[PDB]
Design a protein around this ligand. Sequence first.
Ligand code: HEM
Ligand code: HEM
Ligand SMILES: Cc1cc(N)nc(C[C@@H]2CNC[C@@H]2OCCNCCc2cccc(F)c2)c1
Ligand SMILES: Cc1cc(N)nc(C[C@@H]2CNC[C@@H]2OCCNCCc2cccc(F)c2)c1
Ligand SMILES: C[C@H](O)[C@H](O)[C@H]1CNc2nc(N)[nH]c(=O)c2N1
Ligand SMILES: C[C@H](O)[C@H](O)[C@H]1CNc2nc(N)[nH]c(=O)c2N1
Ligand SMILES: [Zn+2]
Lengths: 407, 411
Amino acid sequence: RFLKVKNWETDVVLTDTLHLKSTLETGCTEHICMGSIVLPTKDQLFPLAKEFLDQYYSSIKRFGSKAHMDRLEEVNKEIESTSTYQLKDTELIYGAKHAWRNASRCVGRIQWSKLQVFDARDCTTAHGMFNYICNHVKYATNKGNLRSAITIFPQRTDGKHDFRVWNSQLIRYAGYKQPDGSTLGDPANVQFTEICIQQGWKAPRGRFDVLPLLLQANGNDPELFQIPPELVLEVPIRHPKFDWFKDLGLKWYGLPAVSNMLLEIGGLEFSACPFSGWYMGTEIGVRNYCDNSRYNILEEVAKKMDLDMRKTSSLWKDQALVEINIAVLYSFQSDKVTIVDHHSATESFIKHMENEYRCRGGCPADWVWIVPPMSGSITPVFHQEMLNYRLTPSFEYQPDPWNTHVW
Amino acid sequence: RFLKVKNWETDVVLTDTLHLKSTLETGCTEHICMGSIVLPVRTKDQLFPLAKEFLDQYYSSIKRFGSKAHMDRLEEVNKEIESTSTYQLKDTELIYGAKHAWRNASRCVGRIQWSKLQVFDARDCTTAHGMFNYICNHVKYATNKGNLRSAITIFPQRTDGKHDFRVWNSQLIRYAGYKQPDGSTLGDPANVQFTEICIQQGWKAPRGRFDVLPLLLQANGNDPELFQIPPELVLEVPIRHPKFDWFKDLGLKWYGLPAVSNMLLEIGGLEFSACPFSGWYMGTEIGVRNYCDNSRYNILEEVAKKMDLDMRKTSSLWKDQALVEINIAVLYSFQSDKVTIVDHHSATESFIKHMENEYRCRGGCPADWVWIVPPMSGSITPVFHQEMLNYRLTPSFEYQPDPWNTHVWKG
Ligand code: HEM
Ligand code: HEM
Ligand SMILES: Cc1cc(N)nc(C[C@@H]2CNC[C@@H]2OCCNCCc2cccc(F)c2)c1
Ligand SMILES: Cc1cc(N)nc(C[C@@H]2CNC[C@@H]2OCCNCCc2cccc(F)c2)c1
Ligand SMILES: C[C@H](O)[C@H](O)[C@H]1CNc2nc(N)[nH]c(=O)c2N1
Ligand SMILES: C[C@H](O)[C@H](O)[C@H]1CNc2nc(N)[nH]c(=O)c2N1
Ligand SMILES: [Zn+2]
């Protein structure tokens, strides 16, 4: 029932009681652990609504009050007659902040309660979506002093009227396969980049082409839109000591803004719900630049540091990886754009765990995702036992709509 | 029912059917994953099925499943069990047994090596002194003057669990750590408690940053007794850096032979509570963990100082810079002295070919992602991008409590 988590660096032991209020399934059984797998009705809706509203009213310390009780009735009546219901603004804001609070894969949740919510449930068209998004981008960016935000489009209905942002992030770079055989730009977005061009995007066909947005309103065929270039804050990448570094022509964008997820609040499904905070340095320096499936630039970088690339045991990949990441951090900082390093992020996430443990009775955390893709054991989270479980409200991965929609 | 794992870098999808032969539990449920938790006397009743399972396995793999030879051995073990309540493994079974425990060790990146394991059978051992000598020979053979070879020594199985063979050291070779009256430890901090226990049994401690602790050995459930590994048997590598000449002046060395002595080898239901095993190091075990954990030698501060890194903001990645140099030094030192070591790139790459081969020939390979991915440079090693299934197969190595917590003293 009660379960302990031990930190093996500090010996601090925490007791998790929050898991018993756990809802969905993990993918694991008594027989098999799936911790490292990336993807493991009126009757159905009311329990979900009730469960959500009970946590809301308890959170505002009016559990069992008439204000509480009255609301449970109204939602039930609306379900029985309308087949869905609408969240109050208070509920929407609480629902959103908690979906982030419950995201077991996010190292940055110390911040969870500072989420600016933009209610875009009155949106009806893709142009409308584009407007709400540009406003999201500008508010969030704040000329480099980034602030967390999420924008919530209308909730699923019969499911054929879904609002969706097709891009996986508001801001990402194109990818083109070349007659050469290699790939120009980001090969993560190759498919999506063709889909855009296959819908009349004049792609400048470069390495760092900011992609156009594909907005789907009300289950309609989606449309292209170019984020005002002045709204996309980008950072040229230089090193505090390697002068030649800029000659690689590396740039990255300041705003990570995840837009392919599904927000579930009290049984309601918000299928377009882009949110954004700010980067941990390693997301760009380690993953975006150094993954083989990505910009994959280690080979070329080590070659400029004059490192011995003849044997893996010289650790040249490792030397170059550090420098690449020093440079990302330095570049963003020089330009006063919010970024956080993995030491500082993970340190803040331990403080946030301890808070969640005494304050909430626990904190679902996915260790595989929380530990940075560099220097794991020199970050405090490496030594921290974490329990992983699915609470609601939540964000959930949804598959690329192009796999789904018809025209 | 088949399960698939994806490699997110290569898009290679594998199909695991071996998880179907798993019986033991994981600590996980449909409602909780305990994937990151470190730790999540047997009756005749339960024993024969475990024997039977095991021997069905052995005979399958030698291609004798169903043979008169297989049925005879089942019957013979059967009888032996109800007559004497336990049973003895044949040699061929013991060897098969201990290879498979390593094979099934899901937290072990070194398994491409599994079929090459030198089993020493120490099941005629009866005293601690007997234990010392078996172990000395283990260490000599395994070392092989720096050209390390994998080995395990198996002392007698548990009986009533009142007569256990134990090695009190968690590794056969490990440095002392001595807590000072001011809170600083002198030496490796992981071994403070064991160090004191040794000191208590009358070991006279040199008290330096690198003293090789004595073996504490328990035979037949008896109290244990001290013993010095002969120093000429203990291969050590002083740590220097290829370009940094001041690195040697930090006075660091490490031992060559990693030899886990605190685990339990279960084969066909039998429990071998002393089965020290040894292989060779992946460099990061020393360079990242042993040296750079805060709870270990903690040399980061000292190394980065000497390198003149900017130490006033963590965002200089000074800590990350110093970590790499230390790891370069470890691999450099070991190669220079011709002591076997493998780097984390080479090791994870081998594990991937191993894993892939293990799906092809065995229908799977249990693997614990959290332990397999190295504790530095995770994503630039290919295991990071590897989906893994973790499950428990027997034979197996199990953790067991430190015995001073359990052992009842005779005095
Ligand atoms: C404020 C700074 C933030 C930091 C530093 C941060 C950090 C991260 C990181 C490092 C990851 C995994 C990254 C990856 O490799 O893909 C992640 C995942 C995630 N984060 Fe955050 N986060 C922040 C803000 C937010 C916000 C505002 C939300 C939503 C309100 C959020 C929700 C999520 C979710 C749902 C995931 C899992 C994504 C997936 O499955 O692909 N985070 N976070
Ligand atoms: C060929 C040399 C080997 C290499 C490079 C290697 C690699 C490793 C590493 C790096 C670990 C985890 C290290 C740690 O953090 O404690 C490990 C764990 C383990 N290995 Fe190996 N291994 C090797 C040989 C062996 C052998 C010969 C056996 C048994 C015959 C074995 C069985 C195990 C077991 C049971 C664990 C888990 C230990 C625990 O849970 O504390 N390995 N392996
Ligand atoms: C297949 C699949 C499943 C899943 N759940 N997720 C993905 C996105 C991939 C995975 N891992 C990297 C990449 O996502 C790209 C990075 N995501 C940014 C997370 C972040 C950081 C700071 C602030 C934020 F608002 C958000 C793919
Ligand atoms: C509590 C607990 C449970 C468990 N299963 N294990 C431990 C040992 C920890 C793991 N990490 C630090 C320390 O183990 C240090 C010893 N690990 C060497 C593994 C190895 C490498 C190469 C060849 C070999 F034969 C063996 C503690
Ligand atoms: C297969 C494995 O689960 C996969 O590569 C994971 C590992 N940990 C991760 N961790 C984070 N933060 N982001 C990721 O994309 C991944 N990928
Ligand atoms: C809490 C966490 O499970 C623990 O610190 C683990 C993580 N992964 C590890 N991986 C290896 N190889 N060795 C370890 O000691 C650990 N420690
Ligand atoms: Zn699990």
